[PDB]
Scaffold this motif. Structure first.
Motif, PDB file in Angstrom:
ATOM      1  N   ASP A  42      20.892  32.645   1.994  1.00 38.04           N
ATOM      2  CA  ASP A  42      21.835  31.541   1.894  1.00 38.04           C
ATOM      3  C   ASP A  42      21.077  30.420   1.204  1.00 38.04           C
ATOM      4  O   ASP A  42      20.153  29.845   1.783  1.00 38.04           O
ATOM      5  N   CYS A  43      21.453  30.137  -0.042  1.00 32.05           N
ATOM      6  CA  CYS A  43      20.726  29.172  -0.859  1.00 32.05           C
ATOM      7  C   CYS A  43      20.845  27.764  -0.287  1.00 32.05           C
ATOM      8  O   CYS A  43      19.842  27.043  -0.175  1.00 32.05           O
ATOM      9  N   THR A  44      22.058  27.383   0.124  1.00 32.73           N
ATOM     10  CA  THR A  44      22.306  26.053   0.671  1.00 32.73           C
ATOM     11  C   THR A  44      21.585  25.848   1.997  1.00 32.73           C
ATOM     12  O   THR A  44      20.983  24.794   2.220  1.00 32.73           O
ATOM     13  N   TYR A  46      18.911  27.560   3.119  1.00 30.27           N
ATOM     14  CA  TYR A  46      17.463  27.620   2.936  1.00 30.27           C
ATOM     15  C   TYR A  46      16.935  26.306   2.373  1.00 30.27           C
ATOM     16  O   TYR A  46      15.941  25.764   2.868  1.00 30.27           O
ATOM     17  N   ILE A  47      17.588  25.783   1.333  1.00 31.28           N
ATOM     18  CA  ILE A  47      17.110  24.559   0.698  1.00 31.28           C
ATOM     19  C   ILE A  47      17.384  23.334   1.568  1.00 31.28           C
ATOM     20  O   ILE A  47      16.521  22.462   1.720  1.00 31.28           O
ATOM     21  N   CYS A  48      18.556  23.268   2.200  1.00 29.25           N
ATOM     22  CA  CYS A  48      18.994  22.051   2.865  1.00 29.25           C
ATOM     23  C   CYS A  48      19.166  22.132   4.373  1.00 29.25           C
ATOM     24  O   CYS A  48      19.169  21.081   5.020  1.00 29.25           O
ATOM     25  N   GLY A  49      19.282  23.317   4.954  1.00 26.63           N
ATOM     26  CA  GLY A  49      19.563  23.414   6.373  1.00 26.63           C
ATOM     27  C   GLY A  49      20.928  22.899   6.777  1.00 26.63           C
ATOM     28  O   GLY A  49      21.950  23.385   6.283  1.00 26.63           O
ATOM     29  N   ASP A  50      20.964  21.912   7.667  1.00 30.67           N
ATOM     30  CA  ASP A  50      22.213  21.435   8.235  1.00 30.67           C
ATOM     31  C   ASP A  50      22.718  20.145   7.605  1.00 30.67           C
ATOM     32  O   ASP A  50      23.720  19.594   8.070  1.00 30.67           O
TER      33      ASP A  50
ATOM     34  N   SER B  16      31.006  32.980   0.464  1.00 30.70           N
ATOM     35  CA  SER B  16      30.486  31.767   1.075  1.00 30.70           C
ATOM     36  C   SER B  16      29.785  32.145   2.370  1.00 30.70           C
ATOM     37  O   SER B  16      29.616  33.324   2.680  1.00 30.70           O
ATOM     38  N   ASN B  17      29.323  31.139   3.103  1.00 31.62           N
ATOM     39  CA  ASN B  17      28.664  31.366   4.382  1.00 31.62           C
ATOM     40  C   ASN B  17      29.381  30.599   5.483  1.00 31.62           C
ATOM     41  O   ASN B  17      29.405  29.364   5.469  1.00 31.62           O
ATOM     42  N   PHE B  18      30.000  31.338   6.401  1.00 28.63           N
ATOM     43  CA  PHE B  18      30.635  30.732   7.562  1.00 28.63           C
ATOM     44  C   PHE B  18      29.585  30.063   8.431  1.00 28.63           C
ATOM     45  O   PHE B  18      28.555  30.663   8.749  1.00 28.63           O
ATOM     46  N   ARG B  19      29.838  28.812   8.801  1.00 24.79           N
ATOM     47  CA  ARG B  19      29.000  28.111   9.763  1.00 24.79           C
ATOM     48  C   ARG B  19      29.853  27.195  10.627  1.00 24.79           C
ATOM     49  O   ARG B  19      30.726  26.485  10.118  1.00 24.79           O
ATOM     50  N   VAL B  20      29.647  27.265  11.941  1.00 30.82           N
ATOM     51  CA  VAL B  20      30.414  26.434  12.857  1.00 30.82           C
ATOM     52  C   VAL B  20      29.899  25.001  12.783  1.00 30.82           C
ATOM     53  O   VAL B  20      28.687  24.753  12.744  1.00 30.82           O
ATOM     54  N   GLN B  21      30.829  24.043  12.720  1.00 24.64           N
ATOM     55  CA  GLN B  21      30.531  22.633  12.535  1.00 24.64           C
ATOM     56  C   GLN B  21      30.299  21.954  13.884  1.00 24.64           C
ATOM     57  O   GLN B  21      30.789  22.433  14.912  1.00 24.64           O
TER      58      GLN B  21
END
Ligand SMILES: *[C@@H]1O[C@H](CO)[C@@H](O[C@@H]2O[C@H](CO)[C@@H](O)[C@H](O)[C@H]2NC(C)=O)[C@H](O)[C@H]1NC(C)=O
Ligand SMILES: *[C@@H]1O[C@H](CO)[C@@H](O[C@@H]2O[C@H](CO)[C@@H](O)[C@H](O)[C@H]2NC(C)=O)[C@H](O)[C@H]1NC(C)=O
Ligand SMILES: *[C@@H]1O[C@H](CO)[C@@H](O)[C@H](O)[C@H]1NC(C)=O
Lengths: 50, 49
Positions: A42-44, A46-50, B16-21
């Motif tokens: 996951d590029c986003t 890995y580079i940025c985290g949360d 995309s990548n699912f992530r809970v907010q």
């Protein structure tokens, strides 16, 4: 100094042949890689985290 | 949108990548509260050299 191999002198002459009188059934292993670990990044994240 | 085309061929596509907010923000700071003596440093009559 590493040895390349054991020294063997072949008894060559113009009218002599060497014929095998027996045989060995030899089973040898050959290991070949076929695939690798399939990785996804996951590029986003890995580079940025949360 | 990911493939930048209006026609999608047959297959599986990583989109995309699912992530809970997060739901709410929690701030944790030390409970102890003492007025900090900035008045002593900044309002003093005399300073050192
Ligand atoms: C066939 O004959 C030759 C000689 O007539 C043999 O060669 C000799 O082998 C011995 C054993 O290792 C060596 O010490 C000699 O130096 C060899 N001589 C030469 C000129 O190379 C050979 O071994 C014979 N082959 C078999 C299968 O017995
Ligand atoms: C060829 O070689 C094989 C072994 O590689 C020989 O078989 C052996 O024979 C002796 C007596 O005949 C037995 O005691 C061994 O147990 C046998 N070994 C195996 C692995 O079976 C065979 O006799 C040889 N043939 C010739 C014509 O020399
Ligand atoms: C700062 O110092 C002056 C005199 O030096 C004083 O009159 C004033 O009340 C002081 N103010 C504070 C916030 O301490």
């Amino acid at each position: 100094t590493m040895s390349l191999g054991a020294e063997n002198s072949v008894a060559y002459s113009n009218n002599s042949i060497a014929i095998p009188t027996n045989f060995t059934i030899s089973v040898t292993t050959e290991i070949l890689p076929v695939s690798m670990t399939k990785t996804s990044v996951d590029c986003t994240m890995y580079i940025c985290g949360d | 949108c990911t493939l930048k085309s209006f026609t999608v061929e047959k297959g599986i596509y990583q989109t995309s990548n699912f992530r809970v907010q997060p739901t709410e923000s929690i701030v944790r700071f030390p409970n102890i509260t003492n007025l900090c003596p900035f008045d002593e440093v900044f309002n003093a009559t005399r300073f050192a050299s």
